[PDB]
Structure formats: C-alpha cells, structure tokens
Amino acid sequence: LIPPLINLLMSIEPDVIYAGHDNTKPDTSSSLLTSLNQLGERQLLSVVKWSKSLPGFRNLHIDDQITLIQYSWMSLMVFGLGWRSYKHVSGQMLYFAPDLILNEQRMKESSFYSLCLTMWQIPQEFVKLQVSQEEFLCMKVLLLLNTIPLEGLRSQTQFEEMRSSYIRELIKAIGLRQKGVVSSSQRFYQLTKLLDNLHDLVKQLHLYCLNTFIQSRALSVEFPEMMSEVIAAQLPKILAGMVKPLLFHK
C-alpha cells in the first residue's frame, strides 16, 4: 500500500489551473507570453497554498518559507508542466494548462521555439523513466527544498530534518514498484540525478524570464504582482550563483 505521507501529498495537490487564454484569436509573441505570465501568477498562488498544507513547511521560520518559494518556483512550475504533459498528452505536447496546450507546430510558431524544446525535455525524460505519481510527489517537495542561501536558513536544523524526511519518502516511493536492491539504488541515483540536472535547465529559464521582465514594456508583455516581486526579490542573485544549490551528487 501507499505510505501515509505520499497519500497526504496526493491529497494536497492543487486542482487544475487555467491560463485564461483566448483561443479564438491567433497566437502572437505578446499574447502567449502574457497568458504564460497570468498562468504563472495563478500557479504561484497555488504553490503558496500547497506549501501551507505541506507537512513540515509551516514550522520553518516565515522568512525561510518565503526564501524557499522565491528560490524554487521556476523549478516547481517546469516540473509540474512536465508532469501534466506526460500524464495528459503522452509527453508529446506542452500542457501548460487545459486552455494553453502547445503541440510542436504551435511551439515552432511561438517565437520561442528553442525555449519550448528546452522545457519539452522534462516530459520526454518522464516518458523515458516512467516516473510514478508517488515518485513525482516526493521529487516535487525536494525541488522546493533544493536551494538555500549561502548563509543557510534561519531554521536550518528543521530544514535539514524536513529535507531528509522527504528523501527517505522518495526512497519508499521507489520501493513501491522497483523491487530489488540494485534496481532501487540505481533508481534513486537516476531520479536524484534528474533533480540535479534541473538546476541547469532552470538557469536558462531564469535568464529568459529576467530578460523578458526587463524588456516587458517594449515587448508588450504584462507581468502580474506576485511574479514581479518574486523576480525582483531574487532572480539576479540566483542567476549570479549567490545561493547554494543542493546537489545529491558530485
């Protein structure tokens, strides 16, 4: 049977979130980017709500909670994007939302095709590894807990304990299907290596995002309130490498 913490994690998953995109008009660079920003805002609010229900998180200092959300939102959103694409469209479209689905042809006409291909890697890897929902749910918590300040957190002890607890839960999630010590240990390496590899992909997304933000007036792209502050609050520092990415492997 499924371990209770994994069961809890499934129960607190956000519901389906819509972009509010107007699909009756043809795509433009500005319209797509704006819908993506609107969806991002909605997904951020959803991440905040999720975090409030996430066992352990509310007991970290409030400053730490804010920092970890500010550090991890891009990772959580692209990982989510990968999951939805894998589950709803067999990994073969980018499933941003039910009203914002980009098949490859739409990607090619997006104006940011290379960015789409970079993002599209994640669901193709989920297809390759056949990631289970239980593994996904645990890995997603670890992404929230995958970067800390250079000086550490205020609730560092509690953070280490919480992070270690979700790593132990990932190991149980793996043990649900992959039986055999060799397979299970290899599976842990592969899934944790995937999380390590996400740091680099996410850096490309952070740069694109920051450039788009700076040039938002010229490009006629709107950035909502919570998006503007999470970017204001940490993106340059993160891009500069003035934080500590946590790696599972050297």
Ligand X SMILES: CC#C[C@]1(O)CC[C@H]2[C@@H]3CCC4=CC(=O)CCC4=C3[C@@H](c3ccc(N(C)C)cc3)C[C@@]21C
- What residues are designated binding site for progesterone? 84
| Residue 50, CA distances (Å) to 36, 55, 69, 141, 157 in order | 20, 10, 11, 10, 22
| Closer residue to ligand X in complex, CB, 80/123 | 80
Using CB under 6 A, which of the segments 47-55, 62-70, 190-198, 226-234 binds ligand X?
226-234
Pick the stretch among 139-147, 186-194, 225-233, 234-242 that binds ligand X (CB under 6 A). 225-233
Specify the residue, 36 or 93, whose C-beta has the smaller distance to ligand X: 36
User: How far apart, in Å, are the Cα atoms of 45 and each of 39, 41, 73?
Assistant: 10, 6, 10
Binding mask 142-181 for ligand X (x = CB under 6 A): ----------------------------------------
C-alpha 242, offset from chain centre: 20
Residue range at the interface with ligand X (CB under 6 A); choices 4-12, 146-154, 176-184, 204-212 = 204-212
**Distances in whole angstroms, Cα of residue 231 to Cα of each of 133, 151, 234:** 30, 20, 6
Residues within window 37-96 making contact with ligand X, judged by CB under 6 A: 37, 39-41, 43-44, 73, 77-78, 80-81, 96
- CB-nearest residue to ligand X: 227
Q: How far is the CB of 30 from ligand X (least distance, A)?
A: 11
Residue whose CB is less far from ligand X, 186 or 211: 211
User: Is residue 224 part of the contact set for ligand X (CB under 6 A)?
Assistant: yes
Residue with tokens 């043990």: 175
Q: Binding to ligand X by residue 102, rule CB under 6 A?
A: no
Q: Which residues bind ligand X (CB under 6 A)?
A: 33, 36-37, 39-41, 43-44, 73, 77-78, 80-81, 96, 112, 115, 205, 208-209, 212, 224, 226-227, 230
